[PDB]
Amino acid sequence: GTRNVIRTPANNKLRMEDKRGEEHIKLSTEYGGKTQLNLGHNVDASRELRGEGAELRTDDWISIRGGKGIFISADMQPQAQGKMLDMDEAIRQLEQALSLARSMAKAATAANATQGDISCQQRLNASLTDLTAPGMLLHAPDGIGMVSARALRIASGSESVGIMSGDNTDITAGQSFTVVAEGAVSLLSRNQGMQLLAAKGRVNIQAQSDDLSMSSQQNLDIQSSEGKVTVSANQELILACGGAYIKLSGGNIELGCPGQILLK
Amino acid sequence: GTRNVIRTPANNKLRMEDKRGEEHIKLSTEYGGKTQLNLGHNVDASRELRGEGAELRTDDWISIRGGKGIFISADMQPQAQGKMLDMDEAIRQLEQALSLARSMAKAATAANATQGDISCQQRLNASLTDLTAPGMLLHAPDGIGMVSARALRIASGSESVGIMSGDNTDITAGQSFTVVAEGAVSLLSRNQGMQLLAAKGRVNIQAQSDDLSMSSQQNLDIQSSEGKVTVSANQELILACGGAYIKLSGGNIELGCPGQILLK
Amino acid sequence: GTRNVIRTPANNKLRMEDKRGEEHIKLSTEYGGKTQLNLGHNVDASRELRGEGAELRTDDWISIRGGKGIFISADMQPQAQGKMLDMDEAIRQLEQALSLARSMAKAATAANATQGDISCQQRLNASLTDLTAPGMLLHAPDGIGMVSARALRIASGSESVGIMSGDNTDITAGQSFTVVAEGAVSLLSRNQGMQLLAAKGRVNIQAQSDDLSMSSQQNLDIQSSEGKVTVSANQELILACGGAYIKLSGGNIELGCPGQILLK
Asked: Where is the Putative type VI secretion system Rhs element associated Vgr domain (chains A, B, C) (predicted)?
């Protein structure tokens, strides 16, 4: 009743369940656990619903190989009406991310920050839009979670990794956040400033083989709240303001000013 | 022998291999290379094992479209016993990441760092848990690798990108690490301090239109090991410690202290 | 004509289209919208091409569960010639990312930066290579896009998140870039220096319970372009260069030098 089964003696089966409102197709082999494709109203052995939709499952490996590209999408396309690669919302996301990156790259240029790699991201947009190149596009309207107890790797071998967020980009490290860049490290805040804080542990800022420049347009405050402040130069220590200066150089101290030197 | 084949003249085939311990189902069309679904003990033309499990393969595009959400999981569910969306380990990962982010957000508040966006990550937990919203959940117990020779993009159009690690979060850039935030850039180390190091190249720290404050509770050391230290103010340069002060302002130098000024 | 259909009264169908050069297989159930597997030259109801390759689609959930690991790959394997888990290009990407991370870890050690977590990434390489452990490997030769209007999460519960780029790693936050590390925050630029810039907003650098050290090998410049520079110590303020020093401590000012003190 309402079950059409092509079953082999080895229990390779193609089962079609006809019960209206609970139709399903099961393509199942006994190898690798039950390696199965379950479509529709998927039930267990006791015919209780164990899931709705499409399940590709195995105890062994799963390989999904698309020579022209992979589109994995949580975007509803009811009744399969539309192209297989209909990705309008994913394309909107790609364009939004790219335009955000481009506007931020202009902002970085204006602030003399190191610009991002717009070229490879624009090329990625071209590649992934309609998957004209064999890329991979993962899109979900309600968020994507990539999780593992073990390590995760996101790696571009030859090009850039771009992370775009309309909101925050939050990194939470249970141990440490480390960046090694072969070229530059550039952090640009556009509106709300920058906080570089160690709740505990030493803060060490080094131009190990070059100049260090620390400037503000407005007031610059350097403070040790409970300890010492030591400023040491090897060649020359200069404090200058408004024509007045104090210079420590050679083995001399020079206090020069156009006005008066007052000792109180 | 042990091979049931529904083969069409165009070589559309549904093959069921019955050989015990090496059962497989092959659903194959000649279009797009061999566009195939291979289940179980998958063999090549010479009947040698080319893979175990489920293979969806084509020379053309692959589209995986789930209107209610996509669960891609390397979590063993032997004999398909359990719900199709049984995601207990993935849910544990989501909860662990969220609780880590929340505890770190409290820590950021305590340290006056810019807090992360907990709201969208909590909403993401709600969405992805059992895929109650059409999200995408990728979980593997032994790690996830997302790799390409070309560019990678991880982008949230309207919400936050959250990266959580029980261990380190390491970024290794073959060229440069650039951050442009529209709001704030906030780096908080909780226990082991902060190292901002340029092995080569200039270190430039600017509050381009605002105040810069650099403070330590303990000793603050500013040093040029081989060059000069220049401290310049536009309005007023003040060095103060213990009631003593040196002020460079106007065109004057003022050395004030309640004790003695000693020149040696 | 050229259409072999196993159709049930409930419209569970296995359709094989034999038209040469446009062959396709359709496995379709009416449940969950049209929950379907479409292989090959996939057409709509009016027999117009709606996509080429393999489509797994449903209005409900999609579950892809591989107990031994998931390989999702946009790597062409023409005519299914080769192993199901043939991942030579993906393995090259994994090795390239790992070797980049290792060389950068050595560089971080040389610069006294906090080293990254190479161990878990090396273990991830071992796990994902041929999927010897149940990991997940996503590889596309032409780039990977992971996008959502909603939040994204990349999380390792117990291990590290590694981001590797042959080129830049760009982060573009529409609101804020926040890092909370339980241990250290370490930014190492190898060649092109470091820019920590707030176009607007206060720059705040704090060793909240420890020492702060700011050093350059070459010239160190501290400047307020339009405001004041204030240097305050609690215990002792020392400016030293070439044997000369100015010390503010107790309530005293001491100017000591082996040469001469010149007031101009």
From this structure: 7-108
Taking contacts as CB-CB distances below 8 angstroms, the residues of chain B near A115 are 178
Number of structural domains, chain B? 2
List, as ranges, residues 162-201 from C with C-beta within 8 Å of B. 162-201
Verify that A30 and A70 share a domain, yes or no. no
Q: Of the candidates B77, B162, B94, which has an alpha carbon nearest to the alpha carbon of residue B128?
A: B94
CB atoms within 10 A of CB C140: 31
Token reading at C85? 């888990």
Q: Are residue B32 and residue B7 in the same domain, yes or no?
A: yes
Closest in A52, A113, A147 to B139, CB measured: A147
Q: Which residues pair with B25 in a beta bridge?
A: B16, B39
Distances (CA, A) of B207 to A93, B40, B60, B238: 33, 62, 52, 19
Give me the phi and psi of A10, to 5 degrees please: -80, 5
Please tell me whether residues C111 and C68 are part of one structural domain: yes
Pair C56, C69 in one domain: no
**Resolution number, Å:** 2.3
Token code pair at residue C190: 């190898």
Distance (Å, whole) CA B135 – CA B142: 22
Dist. CA B55–CA C199, nearest whole Å: 52
A41 falls within a domain:
yes
- Please give the Cα distance from C100 to A181 (Å, whole number): 10
- Residue B222 located in a structural domain: no
The residue among C141, C167, C190 that closes a domain is: C141
Q: Which of C128, C171, C209, C255 to mutate to test the interface with A (most CBs of A within 10 A)?
A: C171
What torsion, rounded to 10 degrees, do the Cα atoms A75, A78, A81, A82 define? -10
Residues 62-91 of A with CB under 8 A from C: 62-70, 72, 76-85, 89-90
Residue A242 lies in a domain: no
- A197 lies in a domain? no
In this structure, are C51 and C89 located in the same domain?
Answer: no
Chain C contact for B250, CB < 8 A? no
| DSSP single-letter state for residue C219 | -
Q: Say if strands B244-249 and C3-7 run parallel, antiparallel, or are unpaired.
A: unpaired
* C223 → closest Cβ in B8, B123, B232: B232
Pairing of strands A61-66, C69-73: parallel
C17 with C51, same domain: the answer is yes
Contact list in C for residue B235 (CB cut-off 8 A) is 224, 226-228
User: Which of A136, A235, A257 to probe the C interface (max C CBs under 10 A)?
Assistant: A136
Answer whether A51 touches C (CB < 8 Å).
yes
C-chain residues near A81 (CB < 8 A): 44
**C98/C53 same-domain check:** no
C245 to chain A, minimum CA–CA distance in Å?
A: 7
Print the domain residue range for A131. 66-76+85-140
Indicate the residue of A23, A94, A110 with minimum beta-carbon distance to C145: A94
* Contact flag C254-B243 (C-beta cutoff 8 Å): no
Write down which residue in B142, B160, B188 finishes a domain: B142
Which chains form contacts with chain C, at 3 or more CB pairs under 8 Å?
A, B
Q: Do residues B255 and B261 lie in contact, with contact meaning Cβ atoms separated by under 8 Å?
A: yes
Cβ separation A205–C195 shorter than 8 A: no
Which residue in chain B is spatially nearest to A251 when comparing CA positions?
Answer: B264
> What is the greatest pairwise CA distance in chain B?
108
How far B87 CA sits from the closest chain A CA (Å)?
11
Q: What angle do CA B133, C131, B51 make, to 5 degrees?
A: 100
Strands (E), C20-116: 24-29, 35-43, 49-58, 61-66, 69-73
